[PDB]
């Protein structure tokens, strides 16, 4: 009946002075915009239709045309930035924020979804949506004793949108909006639905990216414990943002890092550093590097959990991006460690696979490994063992590699390579 009209048909009807005639055209447009193959967004936009759709949102008399507009407008907003902009320019935002008060669950849901697309577009629209006052009524949808009395899809949509109000970084969302959203966020972080937990972690993940003052906000809400339970989840859609949250937190202050360690995160890392999904492995190793870039108290916790063998493991055989992070892990460790701690690292077999990576087409990593190899030698001088150490490096082919690096297209690489040969060979 209303399946596959021409856009010319949709325009003729929507322009008619007949509300039921308009409703059937707006239902045609919606079915156009939600088809599987390429949706005709630009023809709709160019047909001049966004303003009449935006006006249908305010027809509280006709509940069904509100829904079909909301939906249509949602799907237009789901396109390119130029396209979302068309929807925003039509005056859609204040209109959708009104729809949040609707007595019809399926309409308020749709307005949530729509605001989600609009804030998702980037910093400027996110901020505009908040300036129009969306946060107050969004959160009021969640003001219930028990979240489980809400419908799955409803809650999930509502979570996704809140999550886009946290996204996009510079400029990061207003501290004031974050302060207000965090209690509801912390609450969602405890709901048992994998999709809700996924998008909650993504939000925290978004918030904890950036300046340590931002990290503090989150950590002071005491979510670090719950994040670590999520770190041990079995659903990779949950583990991934949970892991990026934890990893963001440990780029902050030592006291912030210690909240993570104190919460037992290190117990999960044998699993994470041998995880089949490459993206997990790379981010777990990155996390390790910012822990080994900490206090000696804290490095020692890495040791006691027997994580050094896993780092040696990753250095040996991961894909390159992960190995690059593993080098930093080792350089940071040899920068802040005990005499005894650098000895342990060597006794776990760090030297052989450290050298294999001196044969890599990247200067960035070579710079890192050379600095690491340096700090080991410096601890070798403090214990008078630089003889035994220089043997190992030669006996595994390291010097074959190191020597040939003086002849390298780089300043501080040729420098530090031959600086070693001087003082030790």
């Amino acid at each position: 009946g209303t399946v596959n009209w021409s856009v010319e048909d949709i325009v003729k009807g929507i322009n008619s002075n007949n509300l039921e005639s308009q409703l059937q055209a707006t239902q045609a447009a919606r079915k156009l915009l939600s088809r599987e193959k390429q949706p005709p967004i630009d023809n709709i936009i160019r047909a001049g239709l966004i303003p009449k759709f935006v006006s249908f949102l305010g027809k509280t008399d006709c509940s069904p045309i509100q829904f079909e507009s909301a939906w249509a407008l949602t799907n237009i907003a789901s396109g390119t930035s130029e396209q979302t902009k068309a929807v925003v320019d039509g005056g859609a935002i204040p209109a959708f924020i009104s729809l949040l008060a609707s007595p019809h669950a399926h309409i308020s849901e749709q307005a949530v979804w729509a605001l989600g697309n609009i804030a998702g577009d980037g910093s400027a629209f996110r901020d505009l949506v908040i300036k129009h006052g969306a946060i107050d009524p969004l959160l009021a949808l969640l003001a219930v004793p028990d979240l489980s009395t809400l419908a799955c899809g409803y809650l999930r949509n509502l979570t996704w949108t809140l999550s886009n109000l946290c996204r996009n970084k510079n400029p990061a969302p207003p501290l004031d909006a974050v302060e207000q959203i965090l209690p509801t966020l912390v609450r969602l972080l405890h709901h048992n639905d994998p999709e809700v937990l996924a998008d909650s972690c993504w939000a925290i993940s978004y918030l904890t990216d950036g300046p340590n003052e931002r990290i503090e906000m989150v950590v002071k809400k005491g979510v670090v414990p719950q994040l670590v339970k999520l770190l041990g989840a079995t659903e990779l859609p949950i583990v991934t943002p949970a892991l990026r949250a934890i990893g963001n937190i440990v780029t902050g202050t030592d006291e912030q890092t210690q909240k993570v360690i104190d919460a037992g995160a290190l117990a999960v890392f044998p699993s994470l550093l041998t995880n089949p999904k490459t993206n997990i492995q790379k981010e777990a190793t990155w996390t390790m590097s910012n822990i080994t870039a900490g206090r000696q108290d804290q490095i020692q916790q890495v040791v006691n959990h027997g994580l050094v063998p896993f780092l040696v493991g990753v250095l040996s055989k991961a894909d390159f991006k992960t190995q690059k992070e593993a080098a930093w892990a080792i350089t940071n460790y040899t920068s802040g460690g005990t005499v005894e701690q650098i000895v342990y690292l060597v006794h776990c077999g760090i030297i052989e696979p450290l050298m294999n990576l001196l044969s890599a087409k990247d200067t960035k990593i070579i710079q890192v490994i050379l600095d690491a190899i340096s700090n080991i030698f410096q601890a070798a001088e403090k214990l008078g063992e630089t003889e035994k150490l220089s043997i190992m490096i030669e006996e595994c082919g390291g010097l074959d590699k190191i020597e040939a690096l003086q002849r390298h297209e780089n300043e501080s690489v040729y420098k530090a390579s031959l600086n070693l040969i001087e003082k030790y060979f």
Binding site: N248, T251, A293, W328, G336
Partner: peptide
């Protein structure tokens, strides 16, 4: 030593 992000 710490590396964002």
């Amino acid at each position: 030593r710490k590396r964002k992000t």
